[PDB]
Design a protein around this ligand. Sequence first.
Ligand SMILES: *C(=O)CCCCCCCCCCCCC
Lengths: 350, 20
Amino acid sequence: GNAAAAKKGSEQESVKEFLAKAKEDFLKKWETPSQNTAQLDQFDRIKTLGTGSFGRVMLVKHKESGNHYAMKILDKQKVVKLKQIEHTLNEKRILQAVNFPFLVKLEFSFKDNSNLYMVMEYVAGGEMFSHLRRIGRFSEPHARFYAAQIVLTFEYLHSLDLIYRDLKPENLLIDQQGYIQVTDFGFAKRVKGRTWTLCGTPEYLAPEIILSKGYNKAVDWWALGVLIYEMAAGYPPFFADQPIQIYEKIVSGKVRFPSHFSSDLKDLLRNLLQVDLTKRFGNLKNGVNDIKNHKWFATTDWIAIYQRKVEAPFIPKFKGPGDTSNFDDYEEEEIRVSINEKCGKEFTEF
Amino acid sequence: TTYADFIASGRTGRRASIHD
Ligand SMILES: *C(=O)CCCCCCCCCCCCC
């Protein structure tokens, strides 16, 4: 990291070695995934932290240790009905195999008659979404700090042949050190070729997803462009009341920037929000290096970000263990476990 | 302003993930 600090390029062999060792670690766990590492009665359910169409996330307390966790609970019958079996299997298999400072850690997983359970590290600082909407927008150094963590995270994930496919402020948690923790791997997939599933979030969808063309990891780089724009502007580059109107704006090949955006920021965003795949940054011959070497990131010490040595723009308020002040309130519902096993064959490998 | 138009829109709250 001093070597990198001295001159750019002298760390290329070192970064290559890091990712190679990281792939070895990942593949061992990918090929033989962990199963059934906890059970429901080992936790006290405290409060819902988030909801979805087929599940919810709850703050739980591990009875034996006293540690707090975020438990994702998925209704097996809901998953099947919404045709999300493979996606859910993808999520768990990938999560138990990855290891990076800006990804939320899966601690335990298990299933019962009714539900699938993924127990994650609890990140009390709340979603970036909540802070972004409240404050309005982040300054460029603020946004850059977060952007850099995503760049490194995507460099990691893509090296493992993983596509993330759901980047948005809602899926980015702020930890006690002010750093990003990426959550929700529901659409994550290990894929070497191109893929075709229409999934993600309307505002963040790359044109090639919308146009049903078939796509690769370049969609994550498009999504980064959307994220950086939304962080710095306070609103996304393409917004409307309905998804249909949003998709039309995305495919038009036209973006307008706020007057306060720096020249460097506008240039980076033109290169990330590029409809032409043969021109989009992150997808060229130099790959991620085109982004990391861009003028907007000139002040960014990439190794220091990874080592978490850079002072964060803000540290979220923490009222001790189990504090949910940084999360909104949700309707609480009793977790019901059936006496009959639901969808046993479908979720055998979970 | 674009900001005002955003705040007046129906998509300022948490955005659900979509799939077909
Ligand atoms: C300093 O210049 C020595 C070079 C060694 C760098 C290895 C440190 C870890 C690399 C972190 C980058 C993250 C890749 C996703």
